[PDB]
Every structure is written in C-alpha cells, then in structure tokens.
Design an enzyme around this catalytic site. Structure first.
Site, PDB file in Angstrom:
ATOM      1  N   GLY I  61      29.887  49.229  31.648  1.00 27.92           N
ATOM      2  CA  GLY I  61      28.620  49.892  31.918  1.00 27.92           C
ATOM      3  C   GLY I  61      27.736  49.189  32.916  1.00 27.92           C
ATOM      4  O   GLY I  61      28.197  48.354  33.687  1.00 27.92           O
ATOM      5  N   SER I  90      34.632  44.640  30.721  1.00 28.07           N
ATOM      6  CA  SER I  90      33.609  44.347  31.714  1.00 28.07           C
ATOM      7  C   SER I  90      32.283  44.066  31.019  1.00 28.07           C
ATOM      8  O   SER I  90      32.157  43.027  30.343  1.00 28.07           O
ATOM      9  CB  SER I  90      33.505  45.505  32.687  1.00 28.07           C
ATOM     10  OG  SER I  90      32.558  45.239  33.685  1.00 28.07           O
ATOM     11  N   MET I  91      31.290  44.951  31.141  1.00 27.28           N
ATOM     12  CA  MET I  91      29.991  44.618  30.471  1.00 27.28           C
ATOM     13  C   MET I  91      30.206  44.412  28.949  1.00 27.28           C
ATOM     14  O   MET I  91      29.519  43.614  28.331  1.00 27.28           O
ATOM     15  CB  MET I  91      28.840  45.588  30.798  1.00 27.28           C
ATOM     16  CG  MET I  91      27.492  45.181  30.142  1.00 27.28           C
ATOM     17  SD  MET I  91      27.030  43.413  30.289  1.00 27.28           S
ATOM     18  CE  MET I  91      26.726  43.286  32.063  1.00 27.28           C
ATOM     19  N   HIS I 115      36.193  42.034  35.015  1.00 29.30           N
ATOM     20  CA  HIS I 115      36.261  42.376  36.426  1.00 29.30           C
ATOM     21  C   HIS I 115      34.930  42.108  37.119  1.00 29.30           C
ATOM     22  O   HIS I 115      33.899  41.997  36.476  1.00 29.30           O
ATOM     23  CB  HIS I 115      36.737  43.828  36.651  1.00 29.30           C
ATOM     24  CG  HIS I 115      35.761  44.921  36.240  1.00 29.30           C
ATOM     25  ND1 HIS I 115      36.209  46.187  35.934  1.00 29.30           N
ATOM     26  CD2 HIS I 115      34.411  44.958  36.057  1.00 29.30           C
ATOM     27  CE1 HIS I 115      35.185  46.982  35.651  1.00 29.30           C
ATOM     28  NE2 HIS I 115      34.081  46.252  35.688  1.00 29.30           N
ATOM     29  N   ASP I 164      40.634  43.722  38.021  1.00 29.78           N
ATOM     30  CA  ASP I 164      40.829  43.947  36.553  1.00 29.78           C
ATOM     31  C   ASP I 164      41.877  43.014  35.970  1.00 29.78           C
ATOM     32  O   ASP I 164      43.008  42.982  36.428  1.00 29.78           O
ATOM     33  CB  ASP I 164      41.236  45.409  36.226  1.00 29.78           C
ATOM     34  CG  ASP I 164      40.146  46.447  36.577  1.00 29.78           C
ATOM     35  OD1 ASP I 164      38.996  46.096  36.885  1.00 29.78           O
ATOM     36  OD2 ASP I 164      40.453  47.636  36.523  1.00 29.78           O
TER      37      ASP I 164
HETATM   38  C1  LIG Z   1      33.103  47.023  35.339  1.00 28.46           C
HETATM   39  C2  LIG Z   1      32.075  46.266  34.430  1.00 28.46           C
HETATM   40  O1  LIG Z   1      31.602  47.149  33.407  1.00 28.46           O
HETATM   41  C3  LIG Z   1      30.885  45.725  35.244  1.00 28.46           C
HETATM   42  C4  LIG Z   1      30.041  44.745  34.425  1.00 28.46           C
HETATM   43  C5  LIG Z   1      30.285  43.285  34.777  1.00 28.46           C
HETATM   44  C6  LIG Z   1      30.349  42.336  33.763  1.00 28.46           C
HETATM   45  C7  LIG Z   1      30.579  40.985  34.079  1.00 28.46           C
HETATM   46  C8  LIG Z   1      30.743  40.575  35.408  1.00 28.46           C
HETATM   47  O2  LIG Z   1      30.962  39.253  35.720  1.00 28.46           O
HETATM   48  C9  LIG Z   1      30.628  41.525  36.451  1.00 28.46           C
HETATM   49  C10 LIG Z   1      30.434  42.883  36.113  1.00 28.46           C
HETATM   50  N1  LIG Z   1      29.976  46.862  35.508  1.00 28.46           N
HETATM   51  C11 LIG Z   1      29.671  47.211  36.756  1.00 28.46           C
HETATM   52  O3  LIG Z   1      30.047  46.598  37.748  1.00 28.46           O
HETATM   53  C12 LIG Z   1      28.779  48.417  36.933  1.00 28.46           C
HETATM   54  C13 LIG Z   1      29.714  49.637  36.987  1.00 28.46           C
HETATM   55  C14 LIG Z   1      29.040  50.985  37.307  1.00 28.46           C
HETATM   56  C15 LIG Z   1      28.104  51.427  36.164  1.00 28.46           C
HETATM   57  C16 LIG Z   1      30.083  52.082  37.617  1.00 28.46           C
HETATM   58  N2  LIG Z   1      28.119  48.253  38.207  1.00 28.46           N
HETATM   59  C17 LIG Z   1      26.804  48.003  38.225  1.00 28.46           C
HETATM   60  O4  LIG Z   1      26.019  47.898  37.245  1.00 28.46           O
HETATM   61  O5  LIG Z   1      26.253  47.812  39.525  1.00 28.46           O
HETATM   62  C18 LIG Z   1      25.368  46.686  39.624  1.00 28.46           C
HETATM   63  C19 LIG Z   1      24.684  46.476  40.962  1.00 28.46           C
HETATM   64  C20 LIG Z   1      24.806  47.392  42.004  1.00 28.46           C
HETATM   65  C21 LIG Z   1      24.145  47.148  43.226  1.00 28.46           C
HETATM   66  C22 LIG Z   1      23.372  45.991  43.378  1.00 28.46           C
HETATM   67  C23 LIG Z   1      23.255  45.077  42.332  1.00 28.46           C
HETATM   68  C24 LIG Z   1      23.913  45.316  41.124  1.00 28.46           C
END
Ligand SMILES: *C[C@](*)(O)[C@H](Cc1ccc(O)cc1)NC(=O)[C@H](CC(C)C)NC(=O)OCc1ccccc1
Ligand SMILES: *C[C@](*)(O)[C@H](Cc1ccc(O)cc1)NC(=O)[C@H](CC(C)C)NC(=O)OCc1ccccc1
Ligand SMILES: *C[C@](*)(O)[C@H](Cc1ccc(O)cc1)NC(=O)[C@H](CC(C)C)NC(=O)OCc1ccccc1
Ligand SMILES: *C[C@](*)(O)[C@H](Cc1ccc(O)cc1)NC(=O)[C@H](CC(C)C)NC(=O)OCc1ccccc1
Ligand SMILES: *C[C@](*)(O)[C@H](Cc1ccc(O)cc1)NC(=O)[C@H](CC(C)C)NC(=O)OCc1ccccc1
Ligand SMILES: *C[C@](*)(O)[C@H](Cc1ccc(O)cc1)NC(=O)[C@H](CC(C)C)NC(=O)OCc1ccccc1
Ligand SMILES: *C[C@](*)(O)[C@H](Cc1ccc(O)cc1)NC(=O)[C@H](CC(C)C)NC(=O)OCc1ccccc1
Ligand SMILES: *C[C@](*)(O)[C@H](Cc1ccc(O)cc1)NC(=O)[C@H](CC(C)C)NC(=O)OCc1ccccc1
Ligand SMILES: *C[C@](*)(O)[C@H](Cc1ccc(O)cc1)NC(=O)[C@H](CC(C)C)NC(=O)OCc1ccccc1
Lengths: 183, 183, 192, 186, 183, 185, 188, 183, 186
Positions: I61, I90-91, I115, I164
């Site tokens: 998320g 992930s989150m 990831h 991943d």
């Molecule tokens: C895929 C996973 O859920 C990641 C969360 C994550 C946890 C731990 C580490 O080290 C990295 C990532 N979630 C995301 O990457 C989300 C996925 C979306 C909701 C499809 N991406 C996100 O929140 O974007 C953050 C962001 C975007 C632009 C600028 C700053 C931050």
C-alpha cells in the site's frame, strides 16, 4: 424498505418457524436459509419448519447446500410453493418432508436439466462436461426419489423445460397437495 | 427517509392492519406483502386487513404469490386503489374481499394481457409460447371470476390496454365502490 | 486489402480484385455468417454468371457457421431459379444455413473437401411482446422449421422424420459422414 | 497504407502475387483465410505446375478457417512451399507443416508453437455433451494430421500438445515440423 | 493522408529503394516492410536498400520477421535512425549491414529486455516464463553479435531501460557513424 | 475532402511542385514521416532549390519532431520555414530550425516555447532512469534552440521553464525567425 | 459522396471544379486542418493567376483563433484580392474572416446572419501558469479587436464595447456596421 | 437481508460455535472468519468449532490466514462441506481436525493446482513464476499431509481440475465421513 | 458488509479489541490506516503498560499511510507485537518488521515480500526532477528503517529490494524480519 414488529417482518415470521426462499438461488441467499434452518432446529428440534418457495431457479451447488440441510436437521421441513418454483426451486419444493409439500392453487412449477458453460483446453472441456453429466444424473436420481417417478421418466421429462400447474405438480408427485385456505 | 413514531411510519400503520403495495410487482416486494399479511393473520385471524394499491403492473408469478396469500389467509383483504392499479395491480385490486374493493375518486385502472419474451430453439419457443398462452387463459378466468364479466368479455377487453376511471371500474365490476370521504 | 490482378482485355489491361478474377473461373465464395447484404452479393454474382453463359456450371465455395434463414433462402431460390447448375464445395465448415445451401447444390455436383465438417440443426429465434404476438411469431417459426426440414429431406434423400429427429439438437458430420447422410455426393481430395 | 508500383499499377502484395508469393499474417479466421484460398486458386489457374510460396507469421486461429486453407493446399495442383517468419503458432504451425514435403522452411530466428484445441460452449447438459464430443473428435483429427506431416507417432503428438510447446527453428527441423532452415538467398 | 500522383509519397521513394519503418512494430506493418524488401530484391538483388527507422519498439516475433528477411535477401540493408529507435527499433537498426548503419545527429536509441505477461495454471506459467527467458537470451546474443559488445555487457545494460545519444550509439557499436549532411 | 488538379494531383500534391510542404497539427511519428518523405522527394527532384515548410502546430512529440529537424539539416536544399496561425513548442523549434535568413512569421502568427513534459510510472530505479533521460533531452533541445536563435544556453532554459508566448515581432527580436512576411513581393 | 464532373478529359469532384472558377468554400468550425485546406487552395489560385480575384464563401459558426489567423494572414499576404461572401452565417471567427476580405468585395447573401464576440478559452494549472495564459488570451482579444476595427471602420472603443457579449446582425445591419460592403441578391 | 433474533442470524449461530465460510476466499471475508475463530477460542478453548464451507475457491494467501488460524488455536475445527468445496475451499475442508472433517451427501469437492498471472519485464516474470511454483509445491505438501496421499499422487491428481463426490472425497482422504441425518 | 455481533452489544472486531487485538487487512491506505492508529491510541489510553497485538494480512500500500501506523507504533507506550497471517508484502512487510523486538511473528504458512517504492508522475521536466528526487529520498529512508529493524546492513537492504523478493516464514526469521514462527497457542 423492510417493516418492523423490534423484529423485522421476517424475524417476526421466523418466530412462527416460517423461512422464505425468494428469487434466484445463489450461495449467500442459500447460506441465509441454511442458518435459519439450523437456528430453528436449535430452538425446537422436534417442531416443523415451513419453507415458502418463490424462485425462478439458480445455482446447483448453492441449492444442494439447502437440500442437504433440509435432510440433515431433526425437524421436518414443510415446503410451500407460492408464485413459482422453477428448476432449482422445483427441486427444493419436492425435497420437503413427505406428506408436507404444498402448492398454493395458482403457483406454477417448472423442471429442466442442468445448464452450464466452460471455456478452455479440450482436455479441460472433457473434465467439465463429464462433471455436469454426473451432476445431471444425480439430480435426476434425487428427483425420481422425491416424486415417485422412474429415473427414465424424469430424464425424458427434463430434457427440455416442462411447466406444471399446481394440480399437475400434485399428480406428478412433485408436491402432496394444494393448500387453498387456512384450516 | 422513513419517519419514526418505536415504529417507522409503515410499521406504525401495520399496527392498524394497513399494508401498502406500491410500484412494480416483483418477487421481493411481493414477499414483503405476503409476510405482512401472514403476520397480520397471526395477530388477529378475524379482523380485516387493508391493502392500498398504487402500481404500474408487474411480474405475474410475483403477483400470484400475493393473490394466493390473499385468498389463503383467514382475514378478509380489503383493497383500496390510490393513484393507479394497472395490469398486475388491477388484478390484485379486483382480488380483494367481495364488497371491500375500493377506488379513490381520481385513481385510474388499466387491464391488459401478458407480455413476455423468449429466445432459443424453435422447440423451446413453442414450449414457452404454450406456457404464456396458458397463463393468459388462467388470468382471464380469474379476472372474470372477480369482476363478474363473462370470460369472453374479459378476453375482448384485454387484447390491448384498456383504461378505466374509478366510476368505470365500479361499473365493470373491478371494484365495489368509491371512497371519497372517510367515516 | 483484397489483392488485385491485371489482365489483358482487348481494349487494354484492366484491374480485377482477387474475387472478380475468380468470377472468370465461374467461382463464387460464401464465407462467414449468412445475412441479407452478403447474400445479395452472391445472388448478384449468380445472376451475372447466368447472363454471361446460362449453360456452364457455377461453383459455390461455402465456409459458413450459419446465419439468417430468409437471407439463406434468397440464395437458395436463386440457385434453383437460374439456368446453370450450381456446384457446391464445402471448405472449413458448412453449419446450419451453410449446410442447407451446400446440400442444395446440383445433384452429383455437391462436394466436401476431406477435412471439412458439416453441422445441422433446427431454427433459433426470439420474440418479445404481447401473448397474442408471441403466438403469431411462434407459429411462423414452426412453419419455417417444417418447410426447411421438407427441403433438407428433399435434397438429402432422408425421410422428413429422420431430418426432424436428427436436427432437434446440433448434429456434426465429418466429410465421409456427410456423403453417407446424402448431404453431399462425394469428397474432393486432389484436383480432378 | 500499401505501397504502389508504377509501370499500370499494383499494390505491393499484388506484385508479389505475380511471383507466386502469398502472405498469411496474423490470426487465422474465415475472411483472411478466404483471401489466401482465393490467391491459391488464382495461382493454380495461372500455372498448375509452378510452386507457390506461402509465408506464415501467425499466432494461430480458428480451426475451421485453418482447415479451408489446409484442404486447398492439398487439393490444388501446385506444391505449396511454406516459409515461417516471426512465428507460426497452433493453426499457423499446422499450416506450416502441411506444406509440400521437402519444401517447408523456418527462417533462423522464427519460432513455432504447438498445442491442442481450445473452445467454449454454454447451454443445456445435453448440448454440452454434443459440443464436447465434437471438440474431442477435432482434437483427434488434428493430431492424426500433425503426426502424418511430422513423422511423429500419433501418441507422441498427443503427448507433446497437451500443453503449449515452443520450438526454435532447429528444434522444428528435428521434430519434423519443417524440412530445413532458410538462412540466405541462394 | 499521403501526397498523390493511389501513388503516394512512399511509393515514389520506394522507386529509389527507400523503405520506412515508423511506429510500433506489429505483424501487419512488419509484413508491409517484408513485402517491400522482397520486392526491391526482386527488382535488383545487387543494389542496397535503405531502411529508415523511427520506432518506440514493439512485438518481438513481428520484429524477427523483418530481421530474418533483412539477413535472407541478397541486397545489403543500410539502416538510418531518425527520431528514435527503441527496443525492437534499436534491434533492427543494429541489424543493418555492418558499415552501413547510421544515426542522424539528434536521434536517440534505447535498449531493454523483453516484457511479457501470461495468465493460467502454474504449469503453464512455467512454460511461458521459460520461453520468454529463452527469447531474452537469444535476443541478447544477437545484440552482442551486431554491436560487438560481449553477452555479459549486453545483459548488464538491458536489465533496465538504457538510453543512448547518437554519438553514444556509435561508441557502443550499435551503429557505425552519424549521418549529418548529404554529400 | 481533398480537392485535386489535372495526370491528377490532390491540392497538397499540387503545391508540392511548388516545393511547398505543410506541417499542420500535433507533431507525431506518422505525420512527421510524411513530412520527411516530402523533403527527401523534393531534394531528389532538385537538390539546389529551396523548400518551403509552412508550420501551424500546437507542438508534439519530441522524437517525432527530431526526425523532421534532422532531415531539414541533412538534405541539400535550404528549408525556409513560415509560421501561420501558431508554432508552439515542437512547432516553434522546427520553425527556428529553418535556414538562416529564411525563417518567417506571418504578421498575426504567434509562437510559444516551453520545456519538455512527460510522465512515467514504475519502480523508483526506473523513475530515476527516465527522469535522467527527460533532463538530457531538455538540455539538448535548449542547446539546439540556443544555436538557432543565438541566445545563450542558460537564457533559453530560463525563458522556457514556463510557457512563453511571442508575437511575430517578438519572435524576430528573440532570434526565432528572421523576418515577418506581410505582402507577397 | 462528392459528385463527379467531367470537363471536356478529367474528372473533378464538385469542389475541384469550382476551384477552376476560383471559388473556395469555408464551411463549419474553423480548425487547423480545414483551415490548411483553405490556405493551400488560396496559394494554388495565386500561383495560377496572381492578378485574378478569389471568391471565398463563408458559412461558419466560428472556431479556433489561431486556425482562423492562418487563413487571415494568407488572405492578406497573397497577391489576388479575396472577395468574401457569407451564406447561412458567419459567427465569431467566421465574421472576422468575412470582414477581412478585400474592401468593396465583401458581401452577405440577404438572409445571411452575422455574429460577433470576444474570445473564449480555458486553462487549468498552477496560479503562475494561469496568469501566463490569461495574459495571452487578453492580448489576443485586443489584437482581434484592433483588426476588427481596421476592417469595419468602427472605432476600437465601439468594437470592444459591442463584442463583450454575443451580438447578432442581419445582413442589412452588417452592411451598416461596416462588416460587409453590400448585400448580394441576384446574379449579374 | 439478515434476520434479527438484538442478534442477527449469524451472531446467533456463533453462539453455537458455528462459522460459515461462503463464496470466494478473499482477505476481508477471511479476516472475518479468523476473528470468529479467535473469539470462539476466547469463549471456550476446549470446545469444537464447526466451520461450514460452501466455496468455489479463492486467493491462496487469504486461504492460508484461515488455515494457519485453524491450526494455531486451541479448539479443534470441525469442517463440514455443504454445496461445494473447490480448490481453496477443498483445502480448508481437508485441513479440519482429523476425524472431524465431513461432507454432506450431495456436496461436491474439486481440487486443482494454483492459477496466477503476471505482466512485466522477463526478470520479474522469472521472480513471480518461481514464487507460484514454490506455492504450488507447498500446497501439495500440505494436501498430502492432510489426505494421507503421497506427494507424488497429489501432484499428479491436481495438474488439472479433479472433481470428487462426497463418497469419493472420503475414499480420497479429503474428509473423514459423510454426514446424513442429525444424530 | 456483515460483521457478527457479540454481547450492551459489540461487533466481532470490537470484542477482539477488548483483548488488545487489532487487524490490519488488505491495502494500506489513509482511512484504514487511520482506523488502526485510532485503535492503537485507544489501547494505550486503556492500559499504557499492556502489549497490543497487530495481525497483518496485506499486499502492501501507500507509503505515507503506512508511516502514519509506523510512527504510531513507535510513539505509543505499549509494545506492539506483530503477527503475519496470509502475507505481508511491501508496506505490510515493513509494518511487520516494525513490531517490538522479540515480539514479531510469522504464522507457519505466511509469506513475506519486500520491494522498493513504485510511483508515477506526469508534468514538466522541472517537476519530474522534483518528484523523482522525492521518491528516491523516500526509497533511502525506507531502506534505512528496514535495515534498523532487520539488523541487515543498509547496502544489503538496498540490493535485496531492487526487485520483488519473496521469503517463506523460516526465511523471514533468518532475514531478521520477524523473530520466530508462531505455530500452536501456548
Ligand atoms: C510495494 C510496497 O507496498 C511499497 C511500500 C514500501 C515498503 C518498504 C520499502 O522499503 C519501500 C516501499 N509501496 C509503494 O511503493 C507504493 C505503491 C503504490 C500505492 C502503488 N508507492 C507509494 O506509496 O509511492 C510513494 C511515493 C511516490 C512519489 C514520491 C514519494 C513517495
Ligand atoms: C435451471 C435450474 O435452475 C437448474 C437446477 C436443476 C434442478 C434440478 C435438476 O434435475 C437439474 C438442474 N439450474 C442450473 O442448471 C444452473 C443454471 C444457472 C444459469 C446458474 N446451472 C448450474 O448451477 O450449473 C451446474 C454445473 C455443474 C457442473 C459443471 C458445470 C455447471
Ligand atoms: C402488464 C401487467 O402487469 C401483466 C399482469 C397481468 C394481469 C392480468 C392479466 O389478465 C394478464 C396479465 N404483466 C405482465 O404481463 C408481465 C410484464 C413484464 C413484467 C414486462 N409479464 C409477465 O409476468 O410474464 C409472464 C409469463 C412469461 C412467460 C411465460 C408465462 C408467463
Ligand atoms: C442455425 C442455422 O444457421 C439456422 C438455419 C437453418 C438451416 C436449416 C434448417 O432446417 C433450419 C435452420 N439459422 C437460424 O436458425 C437463424 C439463427 C439466427 C441468425 C441467430 N435463425 C433465423 O434465421 O430465424 C428465422 C425466423 C425467426 C422467427 C420467425 C421465423 C423465422
Ligand atoms: C490455438 C491454435 O491456434 C489451435 C489450432 C490447432 C492446431 C493444431 C491442432 O492439433 C489443434 C488445434 N486453435 C484453436 O484451438 C482455436 C482457438 C480459438 C480461436 C481461441 N479453437 C477453435 O477453432 O475451436 C475449435 C473447436 C472445434 C470443435 C468444437 C468447438 C471448437
Ligand atoms: C521493449 C522492446 O520493444 C522489446 C523488443 C526487444 C529487443 C531487443 C531485446 O534484446 C529484447 C527485446 N519488445 C518487447 O519486449 C515486447 C513488448 C510488448 C509489445 C509490449 N514484448 C514481446 O514481444 O513479448 C514477447 C514474448 C512474450 C512472452 C514469451 C515470449 C515472447
Ligand atoms: C510542449 C512542446 O511541444 C514540447 C517540445 C519541445 C520543443 C522545444 C524544447 O526546447 C523542448 C520541448 N513537447 C513535449 O514536451 C512533448 C509533449 C507530449 C507530446 C505531451 N513531450 C515529449 O515528447 O516527451 C518526450 C520525453 C519523455 C520522457 C523522456 C524523454 C523525452
Ligand atoms: C467564438 C469565435 O469563434 C472566436 C473567434 C474570435 C473572432 C474575433 C474576435 O475579436 C474574437 C474571437 N473564437 C474563439 O474564441 C475560440 C472559441 C472556441 C471554443 C475554440 N477560442 C479560441 O480559439 O481560444 C482562444 C485563446 C486565445 C489565446 C489563448 C488561449 C485561448
Ligand atoms: C483454484 C483454487 O481456488 C486455488 C487454491 C489452491 C488450493 C490448493 C492447492 O493445492 C493449490 C491451489 N486458488 C488459486 O489458484 C488462486 C486463484 C485466483 C484467485 C484466480 N490463485 C492465487 O491465489 O494466486 C496464486 C499465486 C501464488 C503465488 C504467487 C503468485 C500467484
């Protein structure tokens, strides 16, 4: 838009041991009927349960959940067709306790074989076609059991849709009698 | 919103033995009305029930669930048309206890034959056509029974939509009288 | 894109699309679902070829999953009406309206290719409206069902009750089976 | 847009048709199959003795549409030499292997894929049986013809097509699907 | 739509052995390029063919039909990148006859591994994943051959999108030289 | 829709014997290819004689635009550019890329310039790759704008951070065109 | 389908044929591509004969200002006079191109109607970009008014005031306004 | 929609230590089942819980939150198939406490390997394919354990959809017996 | 919608809240994250000394929504024990490993996946560079915090999250993402 008596109108009726099966049969509405049955049995394991059926048919496995519950529980389930009982609805109607299956005078019954649909590899098509044929046979066996008709008769009569008036459903063995007026 | 009285407005009137049939007749709304009739019959088997009808029509088997419950229960069902009672609505209006069927003064009534539709193999088209023609015949027999018109008159008058005012409805035998002012 | 072809004409070369070219071989294709417009094109080609030469055979290749009966009957009646024999050749499949027009070819001159498949069945239809109109339309589709069985029986040499029985549900026939049924006269394998 | 040639004007494909080259590209279905069939019959009428070249790049398609092409390739007088470019999958592989013996080619980086029929039906159980039985008959006939063209036993073809099976061009030679790799114009 | 003497600007340029590959690489547009190659080879097997490439990439098998035709035909195919050659476009650009591959000065090249997508049983997933990985390796080997880079370098550089200016593409070995002014 | 003259030629085909080519609408690969093909055609017909490119465009895809840009420079004939209506972004860039002394606005045309716009979705590793690339592209386009207008690199970049509109006399002062065409000589 | 015509031999469609009498039609919404077709026909007819007038029939509900200005500048730049004739209507960009014709050679058909109004536009973005784009449409508004005043002979103040909301003019009113020179009724 | 004993029908049966798993297995419905199990354990840690299963399958990880909860908690979870238990439904059925897994007589069971899908770069396709293969083997190991069938038998029997009648599911070791009538 | 009632009345989740149990289920987003935050704040107020149990079944998320839970977990007085059932991806995996040291668990058949961030932006190049710089900063902060909780080096976390990466429950214990496997209740 459902009225109340603290019980809603259906909770109230559940107190007189009446359950309604209304509309297309599917897993979740069927689950609700099964829970009502297990509840009524919990409340009084000896006293009859009345199942009203007004249904155009539906999903076989969902209908078989209600069917096996009906046979499993201690109380007799008395079935009453109002409106129509078609296919899965006709099948659950005839599955009520012997002597306790009723059509209201202007209700109508319909019976037919399974319909299904599959897509994929020819090996898989074979597996699924054999399954629906197995299911068609078991359904006919059970229908013969409850109606008193021979298996061959049920098979012939369900190749295409067959409609039956309430007197025709009595004669066919589908129900035991017409309910006309409260005694 | 449904106002509160602890009842909602409809539950409060159900306490006066008043039930409303409003809108298209279909299985679930029809089952609500059947539940309310069965509830009221249990509360007092001898007291009349009042069914207000305002409907553009609806599904025949759904309507027949209501009809058969009306005739099955101990209490007389008094019918009162407000707005309109068309087709299935008009059928259930005329199905009330003899002497206790009413139109409000500017309500309007419409009668007609069944409409349906099927798609499929010729063999199946013929089976379904037979069934709708049978239902048409039965519904006419019941309309004649209730209005006092000959079967043949009913057939004639239902081939296409026929509209009746409240006074014309009384004349036709569809209702017994007009309610203008309460007593 | 339909490929084209250039051909000497004594008044200059002119261009023919691939299908126009084959019309000179007296060949017509019936491909896909049968429907008024595609059926009218085939009617028109038949009428053209008869005008060009009323005494030489026409070849109608059929690869069709079926289609609309009245549209099919515009082709059927034209095949019988014109002077030349219409030879029929099934390739791929001829199902329902396609099988019917296949079996409707000039006797002795109806063919399946070796791996073509034929399917026959009764009419399918669908109406919505008042019960009085439903009866009118049901009666019509039952009239058509019978007339189509009579014509199938005529062309195949099976009895009416045999065709009726066999077409209540879909029935598939391999090429040898279609010969054995009377639907075609023989199998075409290697160019005669 | 299809390029034209000025000499008096052919689109590129009509020009190559005059050299006895036909292209079967994309999904196989009735109408594009009818166009190939028509081109084959035209070439036969032009000269029943000279080979026809059928280039195949296709992800597969409808069995009956493919069988109209198959039976035409066998019925007409000329050999139809088949050449795979890009891919020939499922009905495309079948038509590739159906070419004149000795005259079926893969280009070096083409790929081939074979598999059993896929279908779908919806209806009464009785009808489901009729349709399933027919897809099983078709599966068998297609396996018999693949065995015939490849030199594989029927048993081996059945086993190798239960699931998708990919072949490089050298693998398609070893399998008997084609006769040789075409690399450079001689 | 194109400038016209049916006979558009592209047909006149075909007369001078110039073919354009523009936009996403896909079977039908690829068949057109193949047909133009074979046509030009038939017209004169000795004279070079010029293939301008402006493409964001596309389908690998469609691309390979062009590649294999480029290698099979008698004439040399000289490639000239205008605008961009990305992925399948960069692949066909480097596949031109060595010494006759060119970038215009401000064109950009991009290289990457295959992208794909399948849905099905895990057994089928395994089959399709194995095949896309085989394709990735074969394409890397061919890229290495044409560019003069090692297989290891091509692998490392294509795991993610990698962009190249025209001078960078000359240095990488993807083309031979920059074309700036016609002489 | 396309009128014709008579051997038959459509209106644009006709004007093509005048060595006149039109760039109209959004710049994209296929319409840009047609312009390229016309340029190559005209060079082959006569490599000495000027080609006239009329431009009325809201802008477009950079790589598509660069196919035209490089063809304009590569061919032997001078390409004279004439803005009618507007030349915005990729349209302005191709306008200023015309041969020196041969670039024109019509009196009521307007020119607009701006930096690249783009968009990506993916893993942060890929975002960085793509962001690096759009910035490389932004720089290279500013270097080419500087070359053709005679403004400094840092100045063009400053003036293109946001949309900037220019009248025809302002486009002349900026170095985007050489002159304003008013009445045919 | 556009009717064919054979001139004693080449086939011209209806429009190709009327191009030989130096007639161009501007019909419908003014937008880049249709406006390029008009520019090219003007450039063609000048190249044929730079002395001879061109007739431009206008039946248009209005359209894109920059596309309209491509036509406007071409009308002014080319050697021949462009005579304008409104049939049906000339609204907004149509009214502007109509009054842009050669002085004395601009006409309404009798049951023509003309309408004039200021620019409409729209944008979305950061406040900084909003101001840029608002300033540009305000500049365009002024320049279009200056040109309208030039061609109609009305003061710039009159034009500005009359174009704040849609203003409809019968063909007689359009003559009186200075928008066209005269009403065309029968062929002479 | 839900009969109101104050309590709805399901809360009422929860009092009887009955939980329904109905329909597709997915995170939120699975979390609801987890919560009910945890609650029933907190109510009495030594009394059985009955889990009625009527499900066409679902998401593996969601299914495994239920599976591991079933194993983790102190009470035995007796499972009862009604209608069908397919794929994830069959897996949860078979994971009930040994001796306490049941099919009603006309319930149907189906088993099959994982289905999945992915789109992206070949490197990523390779990662996700490896993961679904790992999951497939793990699921087979657990099915082998609960049924008493060998791992190789399970692998072979789940490559394609396999349907089982209630007596066949007993023979297979998926359940322990058939329930017919309440003792 | 359907949530069973227990006995004045409680929904099933409300009853379990009395046991200090909170569920995090599905995609992490602001509103569901806010409900989890509120439940933590409530449990702290009830008893700042007693542990809280957070069950996690999530595919991942939004990062900022996740960090609202993360910082709550660290801010509040009670230890928050985390328990993975189903999956924590992930989150989800990040919040799992953020639990109190020694009190992070996987159920035996749960799976973990980690990831780097994914995002997407559209606009002018100047803005693309601002947003690209931000997601890279986020990526590095999330890797720092994952290295802190797992005990792995930051360079290890960076390498392993580029694509991943799936881990079984025993693998997640070896990695330091959880402390042990919970199998049967004590
Ligand atoms: C895929 C996973 O859920 C990641 C969360 C994550 C946890 C731990 C580490 O080290 C990295 C990532 N979630 C995301 O990457 C989300 C996925 C979306 C909701 C499809 N991406 C996100 O929140 O974007 C953050 C962001 C975007 C632009 C600028 C700053 C931050
Ligand atoms: C039409 C009627 O409702 C039947 C139920 C039935 C009752 C009694 C007997 O003897 C046979 C059938 N319902 C169905 O056939 C449903 C149809 C609708 C469209 C859902 N069909 C169904 O559930 O498919 C069953 C199936 C079994 C095995 C494989 C595939 C499909
Ligand atoms: C139109 C009016 O509501 C009628 C009900 C009716 C009352 C009295 C008499 O004599 C005849 C009819 N409603 C219908 O006809 C409905 C219309 C639908 C809902 C649009 N039709 C209906 O229920 O179909 C019944 C049916 C269909 C197929 C086969 C048999 C019966
Ligand atoms: C399925 C096959 O194509 C049949 C044609 C046919 C051939 C031979 C015999 O004996 C019977 C039928 N086609 C149809 O049945 C079509 C299918 C439609 C296009 C989906 N149906 C059709 O033409 O309807 C005719 C009709 C409808 C209502 C009333 C009268 C006739
Ligand atoms: C997938 C490949 O293109 C196959 C063709 C094939 C070639 C060789 C052998 O031995 C078997 C099959 N194509 C099909 O299976 C098509 C796929 C569709 C277009 C998605 N299926 C098809 O034509 O249905 C065949 C069918 C036969 C009888 C009854 C129903 C359906
Ligand atoms: C992105 C680029 O265009 C690549 C082509 C390519 C060139 C050179 C090397 O070394 C590798 C790749 N195109 C693709 O990856 C396409 C992208 C699609 C059109 C979006 N992918 C493709 O054709 O997939 C083919 C495939 C899928 C599954 C299994 C095998 C092959
Ligand atoms: C807005 C204008 O048309 C620009 C073209 C341009 C001209 C001159 C200078 O100095 C800079 C830019 N067009 C674009 O920015 C297009 C707009 C799209 C079509 C919406 N953008 C574009 O082509 O992006 C290219 C790109 C994307 C990602 C990475 C690198 C390049
Ligand atoms: C409505 C009429 O067609 C005007 C043309 C016009 C003619 C004469 C004078 O004095 C003013 C305007 N057309 C427009 O306003 C178009 C409207 C449609 C919806 C396209 N608007 C337009 O071209 O955008 C104007 C604009 C200018 C600069 C910056 C942004 C937008
Ligand atoms: C078909 C059945 O419902 C299976 C569950 C299953 C039970 C027992 C055994 O031994 C194997 C599988 N469910 C799935 O395959 C789901 C089907 C989806 C919901 C359409 N697939 C699933 O959860 O994804 C599988 C997957 C695992 C790891 C990585 C990627 C994908």
């Amino acid at each position: 838009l459902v009225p109340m008596v603290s019980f809603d109108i259906y909770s109230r009726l559940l107190k007189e041991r009446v359950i309604f099966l209304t509309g297309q049969v599917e897993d979740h509405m069927a689950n609700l009927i099964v829970a009502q049955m297990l509840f009524l049995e919990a409340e009084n394991p000896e006293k009859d349960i009345y199942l009203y059926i007004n249904s155009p048919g539906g999903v076989i496995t969902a209908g078989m959940s209600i069917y096996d519950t009906m046979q499993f529980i201690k109380p007799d389930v008395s079935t009453i067709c109002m409106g129509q009982a078609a296919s899965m609805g006709a099948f659950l109607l005839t599955a009520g306790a012997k002597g306790k299956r009723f059509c209201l005078p202007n209700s109508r019954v319909m019976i037919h074989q399974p319909l299904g649909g599959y897509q994929g590899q020819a090996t898989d098509i074979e597996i699924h076609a054999r399954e629906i044929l197995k299911v068609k046979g078991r359904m006919n066996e059970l229908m013969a059991l409850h109606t008193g008709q021979s298996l061959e008769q049920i098979e012939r009569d369900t190749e295409r849709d067959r409609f039956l008036s309430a007197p025709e459903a009595v004669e066919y063995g589908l129900v035991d009698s017409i309910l006309t007026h409260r005694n």
